[PDB]
Ligand binder design. Structure first.
Ligand SMILES: COCCOc1ccc2nc(-c3cn(-c4ccc(O)cc4)nn3)ccc2c1
Lengths: 114, 114, 114
């Protein structure tokens, strides 16, 4: 799986250990080994949410399976909780796009996961 | 909705009011309430379009519905027009990917929109 | 087609000619004229793959058709080979998400490809 967060929060406000924490929490939440979890944080962005430039985050989680109605609700509680706690972004200023990827449409290690 | 534009145009060439104009005009075009519209501009990017590094843009628009043949043509005209007038980017050097997201696959405020 | 690579490799380790090489090789692989190929490289990113900060890349390839099992395997071998040779990224530290875009869902030059 792959989690990306884009945010206007400054680089200095991203805690040491944030990428590791996301990796571990996502490994546990998706039930996949941490070796397959990729995380990407992009601070200092020029963005707005509802016309305001207060802290916000625009995010995506891609996974081959483990994406669905209840699971996505659970990921959203988890990830909004982490963004609130670690980056001080209000949950109602977070968007997360979830993508259930077909294995044939994910490239890795010179091939795909098909 | 979520609108993102990545461009090789320098930050200094992005005018004051650009995120606000995007927010307002997308609210107009999509019908969506402006308080739920998020916008993101990423200048100074290392990119080429057709092998050339003249000004260009790669964009996305994600929305729960309001995506379709006619609506996307309307959005493209609006958005290319905005990038041409505001960023001096030729419309034939812009790509916009449109995504009709299932409400269950959009996280917000500790849950999803389903 | 549009190809995006996000990487923690620093800008100075991206060799001159890289965007043109991606442009030309993707034109050949997809059987599409290079005028249609857009490429975007984003170095210096804060990212981890498997909880490690060793060089890695998170990429996407969007195309209107020419996406599928065998094609995506071929694209992956091509693109991992390029990232390994040029950016010194191990192939098993690369994810490429493939998207088969519907012509109606790609904006360009004030309209869409529909
Ligand atoms: C008085 O208004 C009551 C609330 O009405 C609405 C109507 C449409 C809405 N539409 C949305 C919405 C959010 N998106 C969306 C946002 C981000 C994204 O990555 C993908 C889709 N698309 N639509 C959210 C809240 C809404 C609330």
């Amino acid at each position: 799986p792959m989690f990306i967060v884009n945010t206007n929060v400054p680089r200095a406000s991203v805690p040491d250990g944030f990428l590791s924490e996301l990796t571990q929490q996502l490994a546990q939440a998706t039930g996949k080994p941490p070796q397959y979890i990729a995380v990407h944080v992009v601070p200092d962005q020029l963005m707005a949410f509802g016309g305001s430039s207060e802290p916000c985050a625009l995010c995506s989680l891609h996974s081959i399976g483990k994406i669905g109605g209840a699971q996505n609700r659970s990921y959203s509680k988890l990830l909004c909780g982490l963004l609130a706690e670690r980056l001080r972004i209000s949950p109602d200023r977070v968007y997360i796009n979830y993508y259930d990827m077909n294995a044939a449409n994910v490239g890795w290690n010179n091939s795909t996961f098909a």
